């Protein structure tokens, strides 16, 4: 089986540099050219360029020429896409794909990397703060609000994994500050109030911050 | 005072066939027939001269060309043979007097996942002349449009590599090859057998 | 920004057949046949659906057809089903051995019963108010189609300060969700009459209300 495996996600501050790696396996590494293709979130695919693994010869799209560099190492059968002096324009997913052959024959991409998300923002790592949204008082919903964290993502379980259904964990907002916030509600029958005990478990691994907060009617 | 056969045959790195190496041995004694009885060599073949009786024959110098190819191509290192190694990499003359020694190197020249260090020329506009050596990296124009040193459609990097992995068939496994070319000049003496 | 001209949105009902255009220049789709078509499901890598104008890779169902005419390639899906809903990109090689893509086409498939949004509005909590801040959270869930407007009212007045709303997200029941957050100092939180949230969908609107304790 042919496998293109990319590096893990990267979060960087503007002005820094990043080098995405893409390792090929299951075929003759020198036989095919490599394509780099970037996709800004919510937008379309943009050809970044191609590199020949055996000669190192490259051709960059006119949009990315100069400030992007493609390299390769055939000792490890890996291709590298490096952009230095990031801007926040560069927040995107970066893909490697196997292209045509050494004699420019099978001109398509059948095997793609999984994609590397590169998130460039001037914020820095800050664990969230979670608050309980008290139930209402036809049925009643309680919630957990995860305010001001960076970067994404956070995992929100309800009742120690023991509560599977009725939970709506919503995608985060991104405020002007540069931090995300998120909410997770559980809808429970009307006059179910102090029936069970209702703790939401929030974890935000980049901070190293997980907290378990319990939601209950107050006063 | 006899010539370093030990580290031409047992040399740790071998050359790629497009950049085949040559060692010119001179002014020594030589014993060839502890080598003719192979045990180590899957091919030992000779042309114009014959392996017998040659520790009693002499020349003025010895040339040792060494490289690495795949098994199914060792049949090409012989006078009058064709194919991309004979046409574009290493060519022996029709008048060749010499020999050709080849042995399997899979246990040291292969690598799991591919050893891409050994290359060969796959494109060239004309065949090589005997003992010619081409290490051009020029982009190969396979059409009517010029290339201007950049790869593209019908414009190719002329080299390609073998990618020896240990799980291949013997026909696609690495074989180390040494060719010995014997010098007949009307001039002095040099390397002889015992 | 040279891309192959491709319609932004196409759709069609199940069992029917749609076609997505993609229009290039002389120098690519017109001269060569190196046109290919990739499908992207949200959050994953693009998948090669068609190559060499008309050829399907192994595993791609026969429902995907390729064609080319003049400078315009086009991809046809017959017997449209649910999971064909995705982004579709055309791409092609150019006469200067470069690769170009199309703008992309989002394909949805019709026939879902249309659902009205279920909104719940939560006021700031005690522990948050004791940290000198306050946030109202309007959570809109389980609606289709995924396009709603949101408006916040202090008293019954417009608010332009401190509201942030999500773009609609598709949940695992192929319905949509959104959130909005209005941030206030506690002093403003208990100043005004009441805080409220009007979500407009269908053209209709739905209102929720909350008052300080
Ligand atoms: C190569 O090394 C082996 C082991 O050391 C030795 O037996 C053999 O004679 C060597 N070959 C030459 C040509 O010296
Ligand atoms: Zn989209």
Numbering used by the authors:
A (entry chain H): 1 to 137, 143 to 224
B (entry chain A): 334 to 527
C (entry chain L): 1 to 213
The authors write:
Most antibodies bind to the receptor-binding domain (RBD) of the S-protein, which can be found either in an upward ACE2 accessible or downward ACE2 inaccessible conformation, and block the interaction with ACE2. The antibody ICO-hu23 showed full protection effect in concentration of 16.48 pM in the CPE assay and represented the most potent SARS-CoV-2 neutralizing antibody in our panel.
We then determined the crystal structure of the RBD in complex with Fab ICO-hu23 at 2.89 Å resolution to observe the interaction between the RBD and Fabs at atomic resolution. The crystal structure showed several key residues of the SARS-CoV-2 RBD to be essential for the binding of Fab ICO-hu23. The epitope bound by ICO-hu23 determined by HDX-MS was in accordance with that identified in the obtained high resolution X-ray structure, showing binding to similar epitopes by many known class II antibodies. High resolution X-ray structural analysis identified the importance of S-protein residue Glu-484 for ICO-hu23 binding, which forms polar contacts with the sidechains of three VH residues of ICO-hu23. Notably, the 472–502 region includes six Omicron mutation sites (S477N, T478K, E484A, Q493R, G496S and N501Y), which is consistent with the lack of affinity of ICO-hu23 for the Omicron RBD.
